[model samples]
Target: GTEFARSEGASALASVNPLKTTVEEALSRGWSVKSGTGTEDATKKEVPLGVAADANKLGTIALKPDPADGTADITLTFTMGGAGPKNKGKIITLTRTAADGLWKCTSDQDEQFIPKGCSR
Candidate 1:
């Protein structure tokens, strides 16, 4: 996850990236974005995981690791506020498909602006 631009090297949040872990999560488990899984490949190279973001909450963006919507696909949902498209907020959903031993966005409904997707 460190390869991800949105990934945090340390869980300790600073100015709050809006897509990183909160100040509390950081203070507790010392869990950063890449807190779990995998090791650096000593054989060939290291593959970079996907990046992430949210229009809803800042410094608290998290992905649902479990399969969602009655499928094995992972879901990342966020909400919008205010009024219209340009008014205030928007609720959006991004999905990830597992393949090649990795999770990646296939249908990027939000990639037009900033966020990407991994649909199944």
Candidate 2:
């Protein structure tokens, strides 16, 4: 889903095809699509698909995830190098709407992806 910004050759992430995916999911979670980082990004905007290149190699994400409750939310933190976010001491609040078994990404815009399987 490399947008006009990324498609110009900026080491951006390609959708493998933009048409392959749809924004209906992310938008449903309240996250607008865009590029750059949140806490570490220089630009902060939720642009359409493929706005900015993912700083993280595999990319970064802000998923609400499944198996969450209203009382407390979890933030799976990563070291900026791994393929997945770890719950090992990472977990925060604001992660919600995991009604179904399928997980949904709430943050990080359209840059990162939600892990499709369950964790051990």
Candidate 3:
């Protein structure tokens, strides 16, 4: 005997462009990414920065198209759980390129859990 099953539609992965798709796929993989607080006061002690294993909250993480130096470029601004008040709001920069027949992030791509070589 056999059974029937279903899964999420492929269109769910579809994005308006390659840059967006790269970011979307990278996030889907899930990882503890190292992020900075964008702190201006370097002298301040206990600057909340570095690797924060976060819980996804406050829905709809923002994505902004930054000035692309190359083929792909995007900026992410959002809040994640465990980032704390000081570090919750931060901007993440990412870039993508065409290689091996696909678009993928260029830097930090080797970091843990980043899908399709897309990094934070």
Candidate 4:
């Protein structure tokens, strides 16, 4: 129940991984990364980023190690601004954190969905 994840392009709240560090930190330190940018200009607008998964933006929705299975169920939610089903509610299955100190998250796009007390 301590994981979080999301996608930035197709599904803002799609595919996520939950660990101790924030999404920003995951990209910086958690694990090695592989990305893609479908944009032509690097300093222009939003671009696409390739990922290890078949889906251009699919990764660990959550990373909670089940001492028994080494995996746990995490949740990921999103909001797109406009009042619509696609922009609200808690998306199911996203991120996780292992009780043994191991965390492997897949996505971090729904920063807004993350609760305030989560970081502390």
Candidate 5:
């Protein structure tokens, strides 16, 4: 004879929003900077403007979100040419939050590029 124990608990339903919008926002900003159409401050920084100008395109590597905490981490990768050896596979990390209903970049691990329009 064999005996098994079962556990049960009350389950609660909750709603969670995806990070697609926030991630898209970050990517759009990066593209703008790379294309030389970003804000003056961002252009002056030359974070992505200088090196990424030759980048053919940008790709997303990861997107981690803590919906309950209103925070998210996004990683972006890109490919370029000419001086590609030094910049190939370059990755940019962006930390963002949605505490105010609208997403804002708090910091960037690469070069503070994502914080251009943010409150800093």
Candidate 6:
């Protein structure tokens, strides 16, 4: 009954722009964001899926900034059973530059969970 639910949920989250909104807002949308130690040069954030079925799953979205280049790195680790094609799932890493104004998939380890506009 929940065959495509994983893709639907993942896709919905991938479309969100974390830079434009606060972590609290994302949390309100049912996603858990854990703020890391903040510094002047860099910052870190972690977004974990809030599904009960994924309680034991290792799915996580980590956000970190590159201090040298001023770009942001978003690493998505998916290990949910129904979240992807592979049994171990995969990690989708994205790099957001100041010019693009949108996140671009740098490493598409899992094609099924890739964000929109990343295919090209």
Best by lDDT: 6
* Clash tally, candidates in order: 11, 9, 0, 20, 0, 0
Model 1 Cα lDDT, one tens digit per residue, 1-120: 122222221221221233222222322333222222245333433321223433223333335552122234444444333223431233344444533223333322233333323232
Each candidate structure's TM-score, on Cα atoms with residue i matched to residue i, is 0.27, 0.18, 0.24, 0.21, 0.25, 0.38
Candidate no. 1 TM-score: 0.27
- List of clashing residue pairs for candidate 5: none
Predict model 6's lDDT versus the native. 0.40
Mind sharing the TM-score for model 5? Answer: 0.25
What C-alpha lDDT do the candidate models reach, one value each? Answer: 0.31, 0.29, 0.29, 0.31, 0.28, 0.40
lDDT of 5 by residue, 20-58 (tens): 343344445542222222333543432222222322333
**In terms of lDDT, which candidate is stronger, 1 or 5?**
1
Writing each residue's lDDT as its tens digit, candidate 4 over 4-119 gives: 22222234323233222343343333332223324323333222223322332222232222111223332232223322343233333334443443433232225554432232
* Winning model by TM-score: 6
Question: Which of the two, 1 or 4, has more TM-score?
Answer: 1
Q: Distance from true position, residue 78, model 4, in Å?
A: 2.7
Show model 2 residue runs off by greater than 4 Å: 1-22, 39-120
Note each model's CA RMSD in angstroms: 13.5, 15.9, 14.8, 13.8, 18.7, 8.4
Task: Give the least accurate 10-residue stretch of model 5, judged by summed lDDT.
Answer: 7-16
Better of 2 and 4 by TM-score: 4
Q: Local error of candidate 5 at 108, Å?
A: 8.9
